[PDB]
Amino acid sequence: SNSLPSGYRFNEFEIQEAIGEGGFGIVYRAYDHQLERTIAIKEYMPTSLAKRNDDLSIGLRGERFGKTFQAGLNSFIQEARLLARFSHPGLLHVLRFWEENGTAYMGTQFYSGTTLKNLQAQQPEKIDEAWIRRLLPPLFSAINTIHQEGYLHRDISLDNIQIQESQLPVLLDFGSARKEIGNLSDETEIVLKPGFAPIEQYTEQGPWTDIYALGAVLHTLIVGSPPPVSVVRSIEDSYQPLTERRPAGYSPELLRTVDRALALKPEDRPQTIDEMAELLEHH
Ligand SMILES: Nc1ncnc2c1ncn2[C@@H]1O[C@H](COP(=O)(O)OP(=O)(O)O)[C@@H](O)[C@H]1O
């Protein structure tokens, strides 16, 4: 682990535990001693570019990585600014942003629970149609709020949807820094998410781009894995509609909603979140 230790201080903030560590940042449970509340802190930390120094600042692993490191940092800042536009229960709420230690930090609201990816791995028996139909209204609302302000998410999968103990979802992360680093470094494999990214993301984008990825999330919850990579589908579509697979315990109405979200071409999908939600009605 490259994480700051428990007890580390940023003025009034104290690190309590590193609770998430990926290749591009570290998430900490932390405590604000001024406001006496638990928060999360997200630290930009691209491990392929940078390492932890003895004084716990961040330094480049090689001088050739400086431009890509700074571009990732700039994208991290821009993502914090985008999230700072919203005050919505289903979108990560940005409290704090600052630069220190050669990197950058976002202080955010602390959310209970775990990611949808971890819930699906640990308690797949909890995920049934009734649970999915309770998940969708707040998840729809969160995505639609992004869309209504003129933005797209473009990185939806199970990994960046938090499921709180209340079961309410939170969108945590748009992958901006990761995706910028991948584009600049020709590490294409960290830019799009195979099976979740629709065809128009591989090089025309709009709400239907996020709707496809949400369809792919739902497909993963229902049958356990995402649909085929969209570029492979565009050559020869081996996607088997869920209405034909008929997984046990799932209604044609929900299965058809997933299939429509996963329509290969953008124009054949629901065009807005509201359109997709309307598909779940009439039953
Ligand atoms: N604002 C937040 N509040 C609470 N948890 C968060 C917040 N932002 C991110 N997380 C958590 O950070 C984790 C990031 O990656 P994860 O896969 O857990 O790494 P690790 O392999 O170290 O467990 C996720 O589990 C997610 O639940």
Rounded to whole angstroms, how far apart are CA atoms 176 and 80? 10
Q: What are phi and psi of 245, to 5 degrees?
A: -65, -35
- Experimental technique, in short, is X-ray
Rounded to whole angstroms, how far apart are CA atoms 43 and 252? 43
Rounded to whole angstroms, how far apart are CA atoms 18 and 72? 21
Q: What is the token pair recorded at 150?
A: 């003129």
If you measure from the C-alpha of residue 277 to the centroid of ligand 1, how many angstroms do you get, rounded to a whole number? Answer: 28
Resolution of the solved structure (Å): 1.5
Beta-carbon contacts of residue 129 (< 8 Å; ≥ 6 apart): 249, 250, 251, 254
All structural domains of the chain with their residue ranges: 1-283
**What Å distances lie between residue 237 and 84, 131, 156, 193, 199, CA to CA?**
40, 30, 22, 18, 12
Q: What are phi and psi of 103, to 5 degrees?
A: -145, -160
> Which of 45, 95, 172 most suits a substitution to test ligand 1, by most atoms within 8 Å of the C-beta?
172
28 in ligand 1 pocket by Cβ < 6 Å?
A: no
Q: What is the token pair recorded at 181?
A: 């680093």
Question: Which amino acid residue places its CA nearest to atom 11 of ligand 1?
Answer: 20
111 in ligand 1 pocket by Cβ < 6 Å?
A: yes
Rounded to whole angstroms, how far apart are CA atoms 21 and 24? 8
Buried b (16+ CB within 10 A) or exposed e, 231-262: eebeeeeeeeebbeeeeeebeeebbebbbbbb
Residue with the two structure tokens 């201080």: 9
CA angle, corner 84, sides to 83 and 86, nearest 5? 75
**What Å distances lie between residue 212 and 148, 159, 200, CA to CA?**
17, 16, 10
Q: What are 171's strand-pairing partners?
A: 91, 161
